[PDB]
Protein backbone atom coordinates (compact mmCIF):
# COMPACT_ATOMS: atom_id res chain seq x y z
CA UNK A 1 0.00 0.00 0.00
CA UNK A 2 0.97 3.57 -0.76
CA UNK A 3 -0.27 6.00 1.89
CA UNK A 4 -1.17 9.57 1.03
CA UNK A 5 0.86 12.15 3.01
CA UNK A 6 -2.03 13.25 5.22
CA UNK A 7 -3.39 9.70 5.45
CA UNK A 8 -0.08 8.51 6.95
CA UNK A 9 0.28 11.50 9.26
CA UNK A 10 -3.18 10.84 10.73
CA UNK A 11 -2.39 7.12 10.99
CA UNK A 12 1.00 7.72 12.64
CA UNK A 13 -0.66 10.14 15.06
CA UNK A 14 -3.08 7.35 15.93
CA UNK A 15 -0.05 5.09 16.53
CA UNK A 16 1.42 7.61 18.95
CA UNK A 17 4.29 9.25 17.04
CA UNK A 18 3.09 12.84 17.43
CA UNK A 19 5.82 13.49 20.00
CA UNK A 20 7.52 10.17 20.71
CA UNK A 21 10.89 10.45 22.51
CA UNK A 22 11.32 14.08 21.43
CA UNK A 23 10.42 13.64 17.78
CA UNK A 24 7.51 15.62 16.37
CA UNK A 25 5.12 13.92 13.92
CA UNK A 26 6.53 15.73 10.91
CA UNK A 27 9.78 13.80 11.31
CA UNK A 28 8.07 10.44 10.84
CA UNK A 29 6.05 11.45 7.77
CA UNK A 30 9.11 13.04 6.15
CA UNK A 31 11.20 9.94 6.90
CA UNK A 32 8.61 7.58 5.41
CA UNK A 33 8.42 9.86 2.37
CA UNK A 34 12.13 9.64 1.55
CA UNK A 35 12.63 6.15 2.91
CA UNK A 36 9.92 4.30 1.00
CA UNK A 37 7.86 7.06 -0.60
CA UNK A 38 4.92 6.02 1.62
CA UNK A 39 4.97 2.47 0.22
CA UNK A 40 4.36 -0.22 2.86
CA UNK A 41 5.50 -3.04 0.56
CA UNK A 42 8.81 -1.36 -0.34
CA UNK A 43 11.97 -3.46 0.00
CA UNK A 44 15.66 -2.95 -0.80
CA UNK A 45 18.48 -5.52 -0.80
CA UNK A 46 21.73 -4.10 0.52
CA UNK A 47 25.38 -4.84 -0.26
CA UNK A 48 25.73 -6.91 2.92
CA UNK A 49 22.85 -9.28 2.21
CA UNK A 50 20.64 -7.44 4.69
CA UNK A 51 17.34 -6.02 3.45
CA UNK A 52 15.37 -2.92 4.45
CA UNK A 53 11.63 -3.56 4.78
CA UNK A 54 8.52 -1.44 4.91
CA UNK A 55 7.25 2.08 4.96
CA UNK A 56 10.22 2.81 7.25
CA UNK A 57 12.80 0.56 5.57
CA UNK A 58 13.73 -1.48 8.65
CA UNK A 59 17.02 -3.36 8.23
CA UNK A 60 17.21 -7.16 8.59
CA UNK A 61 20.75 -7.06 9.97
CA UNK A 62 19.76 -5.49 13.31
CA UNK A 63 15.98 -5.17 13.57
CA UNK A 64 13.91 -7.95 12.05
CA UNK A 65 14.42 -11.56 11.07
CA UNK A 66 13.89 -12.32 7.39
CA UNK A 67 15.78 -15.58 7.77
CA UNK A 68 18.41 -14.83 5.12
CA UNK A 69 20.80 -12.24 6.56
CA UNK A 70 24.19 -13.22 8.12
CA UNK A 71 24.67 -11.69 11.58
CA UNK A 72 20.97 -10.91 12.08
CA UNK A 73 20.29 -9.66 15.63
CA UNK A 74 16.50 -9.21 15.47
CA UNK A 75 16.35 -6.42 18.08
CA UNK A 76 12.65 -5.90 17.32
CA UNK A 77 11.99 -9.60 17.93
CA UNK A 78 9.67 -9.72 14.93
CA UNK A 79 9.79 -11.27 11.45
CA UNK A 80 10.59 -8.77 8.66
CA UNK A 81 7.45 -9.84 6.80
CA UNK A 82 5.34 -8.22 9.53
CA UNK A 83 6.86 -4.91 8.49
CA UNK A 84 5.50 -5.29 4.96
CA UNK A 85 1.83 -5.18 5.98
CA UNK A 86 -0.63 -2.45 5.00
CA UNK A 87 -1.16 -2.24 8.77
CA UNK A 88 1.68 -0.11 10.19
CA UNK A 89 1.46 -1.47 13.76
CA UNK A 90 4.60 -3.64 13.57
CA UNK A 91 6.67 -1.03 11.67
CA UNK A 92 5.78 1.61 14.26
CA UNK A 93 6.35 -0.66 17.28
CA UNK A 94 9.80 -1.52 15.89
CA UNK A 95 10.66 2.04 14.86
CA UNK A 96 9.93 3.16 18.42
CA UNK A 97 12.53 0.70 19.69
CA UNK A 98 15.04 1.90 17.10
CA UNK A 99 14.59 5.57 18.04
CA UNK A 100 14.86 4.65 21.74
CA UNK A 101 18.54 3.93 21.14
CA UNK A 102 21.08 6.75 21.44
CA UNK A 103 21.24 7.24 17.67
CA UNK A 104 17.66 8.48 17.62
CA UNK A 105 16.21 9.04 14.18
CA UNK A 106 19.72 9.08 12.72
CA UNK A 107 19.08 5.38 12.23
CA UNK A 108 17.27 6.41 9.03
CA UNK A 109 19.73 7.56 6.36
CA UNK A 110 17.09 9.15 4.14
CA UNK A 111 15.67 11.00 7.14
CA UNK A 112 19.14 12.27 8.02
CA UNK A 113 19.85 13.36 4.44
CA UNK A 114 16.44 14.81 3.62
CA UNK A 115 14.68 15.69 6.89
CA UNK A 116 17.04 16.47 9.76
CA UNK A 117 17.42 20.24 9.78
CA UNK A 118 14.48 20.99 7.46
CA UNK A 119 11.04 22.29 8.38
CA UNK A 120 9.73 18.77 8.98
CA UNK A 121 6.44 20.10 10.36
CA UNK A 122 5.66 21.10 6.78
CA UNK A 123 4.84 17.44 6.20
CA UNK A 124 1.74 17.54 8.42
CA UNK A 125 0.46 20.98 7.37
CA UNK A 126 -2.70 21.19 5.31
CA UNK A 127 -3.99 17.91 6.77
CA UNK A 128 -7.13 16.90 8.68
CA UNK A 129 -5.66 14.95 11.61
Amino acid at each position, epitope marked *: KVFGRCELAAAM*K*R*H*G*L*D*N*Y*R*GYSLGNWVCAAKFESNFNTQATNRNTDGSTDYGILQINSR*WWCNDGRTPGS*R*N*LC*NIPCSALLSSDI*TASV*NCA*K*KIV*S*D*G*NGMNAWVAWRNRCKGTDVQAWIRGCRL
Partner: antibody
Framework: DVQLQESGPSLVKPSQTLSLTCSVT????????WSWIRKFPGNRLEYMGY???????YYNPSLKSRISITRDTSKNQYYLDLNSVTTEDTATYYC???????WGQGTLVTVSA | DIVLTQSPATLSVTPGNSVSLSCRAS??????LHWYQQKSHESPRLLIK???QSISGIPSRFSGSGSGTDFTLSINSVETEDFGMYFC?????????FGGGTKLEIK
Protein backbone atom coordinates in the same frame (compact mmCIF):
# COMPACT_ATOMS: atom_id res chain seq x y z
CA ASP B 1 14.24 -19.22 25.33
CA VAL B 2 15.32 -16.24 27.44
CA GLN B 3 15.65 -16.10 31.22
CA LEU B 4 17.02 -13.39 33.54
CA GLN B 5 18.23 -13.59 37.14
CA GLU B 6 19.52 -10.96 39.59
CA SER B 7 22.38 -11.70 41.99
CA GLY B 8 24.17 -9.61 44.61
CA PRO B 9 24.17 -8.52 48.30
CA SER B 10 20.85 -8.18 50.15
CA LEU B 11 22.26 -5.92 52.85
CA VAL B 12 24.36 -2.83 52.23
CA LYS B 13 25.61 0.07 54.36
CA PRO B 14 24.63 3.74 53.94
CA SER B 15 26.94 5.72 51.64
CA GLN B 16 28.40 2.64 49.96
CA THR B 17 27.93 1.47 46.35
CA LEU B 18 25.14 -1.00 45.67
CA SER B 19 25.82 -3.34 42.76
CA LEU B 20 23.69 -6.08 41.23
CA THR B 21 24.28 -8.49 38.37
CA CYS B 22 21.69 -9.72 35.89
CA SER B 23 22.43 -13.01 34.19
CA VAL B 24 20.89 -13.60 30.78
CA THR B 25 20.43 -17.03 29.21
CA UNK B 26 18.93 -18.14 25.91
CA UNK B 27 20.35 -15.35 23.77
CA UNK B 28 23.11 -12.76 23.53
CA UNK B 29 23.06 -9.57 25.57
CA UNK B 30 24.06 -7.76 22.38
CA UNK B 31 20.66 -8.58 20.89
CA UNK B 32 18.36 -6.37 22.97
CA UNK B 33 17.98 -3.35 25.27
CA TRP B 34 18.30 -4.07 29.00
CA SER B 35 16.76 -2.32 31.98
CA TRP B 36 16.57 -2.02 35.75
CA ILE B 37 13.38 -1.39 37.70
CA ARG B 38 12.93 -1.21 41.46
CA LYS B 39 9.93 -1.35 43.78
CA PHE B 40 9.96 0.78 46.93
CA PRO B 41 8.43 -0.52 50.21
CA GLY B 42 5.22 1.36 49.48
CA ASN B 43 4.27 -0.48 46.27
CA ARG B 44 5.85 2.30 44.21
CA LEU B 45 7.68 1.39 40.99
CA GLU B 46 10.53 3.43 39.50
CA TYR B 47 12.16 2.84 36.12
CA MET B 48 15.87 3.31 36.83
CA GLY B 49 17.20 3.10 33.30
CA TYR B 50 18.32 0.96 30.38
CA UNK B 51 21.25 0.48 28.05
CA UNK B 52 20.61 0.10 24.31
CA UNK B 53 22.43 -2.00 21.69
CA UNK B 54 24.76 0.87 20.79
CA UNK B 55 25.82 1.07 24.42
CA UNK B 56 24.08 4.41 24.91
CA UNK B 57 22.35 4.78 28.28
CA TYR B 58 19.30 6.50 29.73
CA TYR B 59 19.07 7.13 33.47
CA ASN B 60 16.16 8.39 35.55
CA PRO B 61 16.95 11.95 36.71
CA SER B 62 15.50 10.95 40.09
CA LEU B 63 18.72 8.96 40.63
CA LYS B 64 20.70 12.21 40.55
CA SER B 65 23.47 10.61 38.44
CA ARG B 66 24.44 8.04 41.09
CA ILE B 67 23.56 5.26 38.65
CA SER B 68 25.56 3.26 36.13
CA ILE B 69 24.48 0.37 33.89
CA THR B 70 27.17 -1.59 32.06
CA ARG B 71 27.38 -4.79 29.99
CA ASP B 72 29.84 -7.67 29.91
CA THR B 73 29.51 -9.57 26.61
CA SER B 74 31.83 -12.46 27.46
CA LYS B 75 29.82 -13.21 30.60
CA ASN B 76 26.52 -12.44 28.86
CA GLN B 77 25.26 -10.34 31.76
CA TYR B 78 24.75 -6.67 32.64
CA TYR B 79 24.94 -4.71 35.88
CA LEU B 80 23.64 -1.91 38.04
CA ASP B 81 25.85 0.30 40.20
CA LEU B 82 24.19 2.81 42.53
CA ASN B 83 26.52 5.15 44.44
CA SER B 84 26.23 6.69 47.93
CA VAL B 85 23.06 4.81 48.90
CA THR B 86 20.77 5.84 51.76
CA THR B 87 17.87 4.02 53.42
CA GLU B 88 15.87 5.66 50.63
CA ASP B 89 17.39 3.13 48.24
CA THR B 90 15.96 0.15 50.13
CA ALA B 91 13.77 -1.72 47.63
CA THR B 92 13.22 -4.80 45.47
CA TYR B 93 15.36 -4.62 42.33
CA TYR B 94 14.42 -6.17 39.00
CA CYS B 95 16.24 -6.54 35.71
CA UNK B 96 14.18 -6.89 32.55
CA UNK B 97 14.46 -6.47 28.81
CA UNK B 98 13.30 -3.16 27.33
CA UNK B 99 10.26 -4.82 25.71
CA UNK B 100 9.13 -5.89 29.17
CA UNK B 101 8.50 -9.57 28.31
CA UNK B 102 11.47 -10.88 30.26
CA TRP B 103 11.87 -10.09 33.95
CA GLY B 104 14.20 -11.43 36.60
CA GLN B 105 12.82 -12.68 39.92
CA GLY B 106 13.56 -9.41 41.68
CA THR B 107 15.79 -9.17 44.75
CA LEU B 108 15.31 -7.20 47.95
CA VAL B 109 18.22 -4.98 48.89
CA THR B 110 18.05 -3.35 52.30
CA VAL B 111 20.19 -0.33 53.13
CA SER B 112 20.90 -0.14 56.86
CA ALA B 113 23.61 1.05 59.26
CA ASP C 1 8.28 14.22 34.11
CA ILE C 2 4.97 12.82 32.94
CA VAL C 3 2.74 11.88 35.87
CA LEU C 4 0.41 8.90 35.64
CA THR C 5 -2.48 8.76 38.09
CA GLN C 6 -4.46 5.61 38.72
CA SER C 7 -7.88 5.65 40.36
CA PRO C 8 -9.32 3.86 42.22
CA ALA C 9 -6.37 2.81 44.39
CA THR C 10 -8.18 -0.31 45.56
CA LEU C 11 -11.03 -2.27 44.01
CA SER C 12 -12.97 -5.19 45.45
CA VAL C 13 -14.83 -7.54 43.11
CA THR C 14 -16.53 -10.94 43.08
CA PRO C 15 -15.14 -13.49 40.59
CA GLY C 16 -17.29 -13.58 37.48
CA ASN C 17 -17.77 -9.82 37.55
CA SER C 18 -16.01 -7.41 35.21
CA VAL C 19 -13.93 -4.40 36.23
CA SER C 20 -12.29 -1.42 34.57
CA LEU C 21 -9.14 0.26 35.88
CA SER C 22 -8.24 3.88 35.07
CA CYS C 23 -4.91 5.57 34.37
CA ARG C 24 -4.55 9.22 33.34
CA ALA C 25 -1.39 11.03 32.21
CA SER C 26 -0.48 14.63 33.09
CA UNK C 27 0.01 15.27 29.35
CA UNK C 28 -0.62 13.47 26.07
CA UNK C 29 1.34 10.32 25.35
CA UNK C 30 -0.50 9.03 22.29
CA UNK C 31 -0.78 5.23 22.57
CA UNK C 32 2.39 4.88 24.65
CA LEU C 33 0.76 3.48 27.78
CA HIS C 34 1.35 -0.11 28.95
CA TRP C 35 -0.25 -2.31 31.61
CA TYR C 36 1.47 -4.59 34.10
CA GLN C 37 0.19 -7.00 36.70
CA GLN C 38 2.12 -7.93 39.85
CA LYS C 39 1.40 -10.53 42.53
CA SER C 40 3.05 -10.59 45.95
CA HIS C 41 6.60 -11.96 45.89
CA GLU C 42 6.61 -11.80 42.09
CA SER C 43 7.91 -9.79 39.14
CA PRO C 44 5.68 -7.56 36.97
CA ARG C 45 4.02 -9.19 33.94
CA LEU C 46 3.18 -7.19 30.80
CA LEU C 47 -0.56 -7.55 30.06
CA ILE C 48 -1.19 -4.92 27.38
CA LYS C 49 1.24 -2.87 25.32
CA UNK C 50 0.69 0.45 23.54
CA UNK C 51 -2.73 1.20 25.05
CA UNK C 52 -4.53 -1.73 23.40
CA GLN C 53 -2.17 -4.23 21.72
CA SER C 54 -2.52 -7.81 22.97
CA ILE C 55 0.33 -9.88 24.39
CA SER C 56 0.90 -13.54 23.51
CA GLY C 57 0.29 -15.75 26.55
CA ILE C 58 -2.00 -13.29 28.34
CA PRO C 59 -5.66 -14.26 28.89
CA SER C 60 -8.09 -12.78 26.35
CA ARG C 61 -10.31 -11.34 29.11
CA PHE C 62 -7.77 -8.52 29.47
CA SER C 63 -8.15 -5.54 27.15
CA GLY C 64 -6.96 -1.96 27.10
CA SER C 65 -8.32 1.20 25.53
CA GLY C 66 -7.52 4.89 25.42
CA SER C 67 -5.28 7.46 23.76
CA GLY C 68 -3.95 10.88 24.75
CA THR C 69 -4.32 11.18 28.52
CA ASP C 70 -7.17 8.85 29.41
CA PHE C 71 -6.66 5.07 29.51
CA THR C 72 -8.42 2.04 30.99
CA LEU C 73 -7.56 -1.61 31.48
CA SER C 74 -10.52 -3.99 31.38
CA ILE C 75 -10.94 -7.48 32.77
CA ASN C 76 -13.98 -9.24 31.39
CA SER C 77 -15.18 -11.67 34.09
CA VAL C 78 -12.54 -11.55 36.85
CA GLU C 79 -10.84 -14.77 37.90
CA THR C 80 -9.05 -15.79 41.10
CA GLU C 81 -5.76 -15.64 39.23
CA ASP C 82 -6.36 -11.93 38.55
CA PHE C 83 -6.16 -10.61 42.12
CA GLY C 84 -3.05 -8.50 42.61
CA MET C 85 -1.63 -5.09 41.69
CA TYR C 86 -2.09 -3.35 38.32
CA PHE C 87 0.26 -0.65 37.02
CA CYS C 88 0.29 1.51 33.92
CA UNK C 89 3.55 2.82 32.49
CA UNK C 90 4.28 5.43 29.80
CA UNK C 91 7.18 5.16 27.35
CA UNK C 92 6.42 8.31 25.39
CA UNK C 93 9.06 10.33 27.18
CA UNK C 94 12.16 9.77 29.26
CA UNK C 95 12.23 9.09 32.10
CA UNK C 96 9.66 6.28 31.80
CA UNK C 97 7.19 6.55 34.66
CA PHE C 98 4.66 4.31 36.41
CA GLY C 99 1.27 5.16 37.89
CA GLY C 100 0.64 4.57 41.59
CA GLY C 101 -1.16 1.30 40.91
CA THR C 102 -4.57 -0.18 41.64
CA LYS C 103 -5.10 -3.19 43.89
CA LEU C 104 -7.69 -5.76 42.82
CA GLU C 105 -8.96 -8.10 45.55
CA ILE C 106 -11.83 -10.50 46.20
CA LYS C 107 -15.08 -8.95 47.43
Amino acid sequence: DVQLQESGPSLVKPSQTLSLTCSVTGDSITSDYWSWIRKFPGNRLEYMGYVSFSGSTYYNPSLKSRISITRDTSKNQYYLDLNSVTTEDTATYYCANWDGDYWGQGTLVTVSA
Amino acid sequence: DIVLTQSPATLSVTPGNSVSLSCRASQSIGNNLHWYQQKSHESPRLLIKYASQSISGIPSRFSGSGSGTDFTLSINSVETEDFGMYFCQQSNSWPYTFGGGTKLEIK
